[PDB]
Amino acid sequence: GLFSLDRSYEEVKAAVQQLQTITFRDATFTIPDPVIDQHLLIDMKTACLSMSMVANLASELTMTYVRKLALEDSSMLLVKCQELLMRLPARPQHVSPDDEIARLSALFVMLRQLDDLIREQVVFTVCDVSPDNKSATCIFK
Amino acid sequence: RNMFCVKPLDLNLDRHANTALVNAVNKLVYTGRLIMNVRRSWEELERKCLARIQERCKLLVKELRMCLSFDSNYCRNILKHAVENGD
Numbered sequence: 001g002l003f004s005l006d007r008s009y010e011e012v013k014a015a016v017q018q019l020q021t022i023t024f025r026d027a028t029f030t031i032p033d034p035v036i037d038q039h040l041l042i043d044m045k046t047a048c049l050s051m052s053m054v055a056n057l058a059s060e061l062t063m064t065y066v067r068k069l070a071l072e073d074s075s076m077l078l079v080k081c082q083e084l085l086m087r088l089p090a091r092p093q094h095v096s097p098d099d100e101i102a103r104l105s106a107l108f109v110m111l112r113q114l115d116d117l118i119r120e121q122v123v124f125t126v127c128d129v130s131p132d133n134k135s136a137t138c139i140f141k
Numbered sequence: 142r143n144m145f146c147v148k149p150l151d152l153n154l155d156r157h158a159n160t161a162l163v164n165a166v167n168k169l170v171y172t173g174r175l176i177m178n179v180r181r182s183w184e185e186l187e188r189k190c191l192a193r194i195q196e197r198c199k200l201l202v203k204e205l206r207m208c209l210s211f212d213s214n215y216c217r218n219i220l221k222h223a224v225e226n227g228d
Contacts, residue, residue: 094161 001040002047043117054110059103061092144182149175187227194224 003015020031070082122140129136154171155164202220205213 091158091160 001036001044004036047114047117050110050114054107054114057103057107057110059100061095061100144179144186191224198224
C-alpha cells in the first residue's frame with residue numbers, strides 16, 4: 001500500500017513479484033490481488049500520522065544511538081542494519097530523566113498505535129499439537 | 142583602575158567542552174565579579190574624596206576662626222553644612 005503511491009503500474013508489477021513470496025516455516029505462500037482500497041487508505045493515513053508523531057517525539061539520544069554504537073562496536077547485525085540508513089566523543093547538549101521518561105511513554109504509545117495495524121488479534125494459544133500436525137489444543141476463546 | 146569603561150566578556154568563556162550549567166554559571170559569576178568590582182571601586186573613591194574634603198572643612202573652620210570678622214562669619218556660615226553626601 002505504501003509503495004502504491006506515485007509509482008508506475010509496472011513498478012508495482014515489479015514489486016509484487018518481490019513481495020508475494022512468503023516462505024514461512026519451509027512452506028511457500030502467495031499474496032492474492034494486492035489492490036488499493038479505502039480501508040487501506042485509512043491504514044496508510046494512520047501509519048503516516050503515527051510515523052510523523054514518532055519522528056517528532058524522537059529525542060536526540062534515540063536518534064544518535066545507532067551512530068554512537070556504530071563508531072565503536074562491530075557486528076554483522078550492526079552492518080546489516082547500518083546499510084539501510086543514510087550517510088550523515090561529544091557531550092550531550094541537554095538530558096533530563098523526567099522529561100525523557102515522558103517522551104518514552106508517549107513514544108511507546110505511538111509505537112503501539114503503529115503496532116496495532118499489523119497485529120490483528122490473538123484468538124488461539126496452542127498447548128499441544130497432534131504429532132501428525134493435523135490437530136491441536138488451545139485456550140483463550 | 143578605571144570604573145567608567147565597561148568591558149563585558151572580552152575573550153570567549155562559552156566553552157562547549159564543559160557542562161552548559163557550568164558555562165552559564167561561569168558567565169554569571171563573571172558578571173557578579175564585574176558588578177562587585179565597580180561597586181567597591183566607586184565606594185572607595187567617594188569615601189577618599191569625602192574624607193579629604195571633610196578634613197579640608199575642619200582645617201578651614203580652624204584657621205578662619207582666629208580673626209573675628211563679618212567675612213569670617215559669612216564664610217563660616219557657608220561652611221557649617223555637612224559634607225557626608227553628594228547632595
